[PDB]
Amino acid sequence: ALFKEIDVNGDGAVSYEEVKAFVSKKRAIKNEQLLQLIFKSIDADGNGEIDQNEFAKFYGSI
Amino acid sequence: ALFKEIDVNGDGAVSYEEVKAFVSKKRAIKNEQLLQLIFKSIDADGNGEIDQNEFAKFYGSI
Amino acid sequence: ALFKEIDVNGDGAVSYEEVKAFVSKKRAIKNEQLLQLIFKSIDADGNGEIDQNEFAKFYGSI
Ligand SMILES: [Ba+2]
Ligand SMILES: [Ba+2]
Ligand SMILES: [Ba+2]
Ligand SMILES: [Ba+2]
Ligand SMILES: [Ba+2]
Ligand SMILES: [Ba+2]
Ligand SMILES: [Ba+2]
Ligand SMILES: [Ba+2]
Ligand SMILES: [Ba+2]
Which UniProt keywords apply (chains A, B, C)? Predict the structure, then answer.
């Protein structure tokens, strides 16, 4: 449950400092998750890296 | 006065480095201030922490 | 070329870690570049710093 994720110390309470620590790491993730998506959207062969011809395709008109 | 806040060293000038340091800490505050607001909006008893039943209320439909 | 900027190590590939490092430093720049613009927009004499009377002008109605 979401509460148990935030209430890190596990004492049934969520301190401000904890909410804050969560609120941020939540945001910190759809960043990593979006970028990853954007990435693999470019890396076609899922080989781990983008070469010139993938980067080439990705950009431009038509 | 706002100028005296930014011109930290107090020499009548505001360097870029200072504006920058201010511009950021200004932003750094409505973050803390908004979240705090959001927080105490959830913590009903203002006891310092949110328990399950407050978190319970906060979320959901109806 | 943009690719050579990102592919820092210069091995023809762009790792995620690199894209990420780029994506951020790109963003990190229009920040510095916008603020600088805003700054020199205030510093009229381009002397390096804003005095009271420039800051005075900058603010307000009429
Ligand atoms: Ba706790
Ligand atoms: Ba893929
Ligand atoms: Ba590839
Ligand atoms: Ba100064
Ligand atoms: Ba309250
Ligand atoms: Ba409470
Ligand atoms: Ba590389
Ligand atoms: Ba100027
Ligand atoms: Ba000046």
Answer: Actin-binding, Calcium, Cell projection, Cytoplasm, Endocytosis, Metal-binding, Phagocytosis, Repeat
Whole-angstrom Cα distance, residue C12 to residue A55?
11
Q: What is the DSSP string of B24-45?
A: HHHHHHHHHHHHHHHHHHH-TT
CATH number at residue C58: 1.10.238.10
Q: Which domain holds residue A34?
A: 1-62
Method: X-ray
d(CA B19, CA C39): 8
Number of domains in chain A: 1
Nearest C-alpha neighbor of A3 from the set B57, B41, B37 = B57
Measured between alpha carbons, how far is A48 from B8 in angstroms, rounded to an integer? 48
B17 is in an annotated binding site: no
In Å, how far is C62's CA from the nearest CA of chain B?
Answer: 19
Contact C13 A39 (CB under 8 A): no
Provide the 10 A C-beta neighbour count for residue A57.
11
Resolution (A): 3.2
- Chain C positions contacting chain A at CB under 8 Å are 3, 12-16, 19-20, 23
